[PDB]
From a paper:
Here, we describe the structure and function of the first member of a family of protein phosphatases that is specific to fungi, protein phosphatase Z1 (PPZ1) from Candida albicans. Like other fungus-specific phosphatases, C. albicans PPZ1 (484 amino acids [aa], 54.4 kDa) has two domains: an N-terminal intrinsically disordered protein (IDP) domain (aa 1 to 170 [PPZ1Nterm]) and a C-terminal catalytic domain (aa 171 to 484 [PPZ1cat]). PPZ1cat and human PP1α exhibit 66% sequence identity throughout their catalytic domains, and the 6 residues that coordinate the active site metals are 100% conserved.
In order to understand the molecular consequences of the sequence differences between PPZ1 and PP1α and the role of the PPZ1 C-terminal residues in PPZ1 function, we determined the 3-dimensional crystal structure of PPZ1cat to 2.61 Å resolution. The PPZ1cat structure includes residues 171 to 478. As expected, the PPZ1cat structure adopts the canonical PP1 fold, comprising a mixed α/β protein, whose central loops are positioned to coordinate the active site metals. The most significant difference is in the N-terminal region, where the PPZ1cat helix A′ extends for one more turn compared with PP1α and the loop connecting helix A′ to helix A (L1) adopts a conformation distinct from that in PP1α. Although the sequences of L1 between PPZ1cat and PP1α are only 33% identical, this change of conformation is primarily due to a single amino acid change in helix C, Tyr144PP1α to Cys309PPZ1. The much smaller cysteine side chain creates a hydrophobic pocket into which the side chain of Val193PPZ1 binds. The newly widened Z1-helix binding pocket results in the second significant structural difference between PPZ1cat and PP1α: the C-terminal residues of PPZ1cat are not disordered like they are in PP1α, but instead form an α-helix that nestles into this newly widened Z1-helix binding pocket. This interaction is stabilized by hydrophobic interactions between the C-terminal helix and residues from helices A′ and B, with the interaction centered on PPZ1 C-terminal helix residue Met473PPZ1. Finally, the experimental B-factors for residues in the Z1-helix are higher than the rest of PPZ1cat, suggesting that the Z1-helix is more dynamic than the rest of the PPZ1cat.
Numbering used by the authors: 169 to 478
Write the structure that this text describes.
Amino acid sequence: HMIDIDSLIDKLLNAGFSGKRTKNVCLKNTEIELICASAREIFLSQPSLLELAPPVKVVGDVHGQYHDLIRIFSKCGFPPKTNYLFLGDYVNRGKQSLETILLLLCYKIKYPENFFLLRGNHECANVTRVYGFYDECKRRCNIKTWKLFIDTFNTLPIAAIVAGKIFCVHGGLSPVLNSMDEIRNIARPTDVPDFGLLNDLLWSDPADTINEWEDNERGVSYVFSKVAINKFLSKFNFDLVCRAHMVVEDGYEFFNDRTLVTVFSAPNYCGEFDNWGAVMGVSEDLLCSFELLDPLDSAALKQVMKKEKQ
């Protein structure tokens, strides 16, 4: 029997609109298994480097903040009337990583040509072991379920080009990125390597450094200067680098005279930063606009979920 994607999405949406956290996921592990297999099939069939036509809305980190994800869809439009590109980091830190990733995967399944998910640095075995998702899988489901997600994470595409002009990646640039074909030819499935192209694309950060490339003092990959950005844009004839991978107070933040933008969509990240979330709309004429989401507490979020149910 084939996947009842309508019934799965409904259960997921209902779980979110309840505002309630349950130890049991509203979906059976067999259903979770089917979702991961279906999504995996699509990921491997579509290119490693997505090439998307506008309009589209770009979403940064969500990090398990499921109620905020629903706020995003409510405010920016539900699929498939609104086209989405997510920049990765769907799990860890947040309270409802499972609901979050499952809903995103289901939408990918139902609308494979209008809905897109990139790989973030958190979508790997190493990081999920540390910041909650492995423990959440073990506690709410099992370790076998976790492994299935990792198998699925390993097949995610790495980068996207919007309208031939906006380069989209989770982390940033690489010192060993010679051509777009190198991203296209990243073999999948794959774990995140400790070094190399894929490691850089997920972990690099921009900085106003003196050298084009220096070691990232966050511990992984490199930091790249304004010059590196200007060179990259000029080499591949791009206008904008759109990335995530960093919490910013207003949900978004331009750099190097608006040639790079950081988009972050987890309001009040870690419960500590009190940041806004942002979603970047890219018009058919390549105009970039920003819809913002303010940080709500647990009680206000529940009220918005209560509200949105009608």
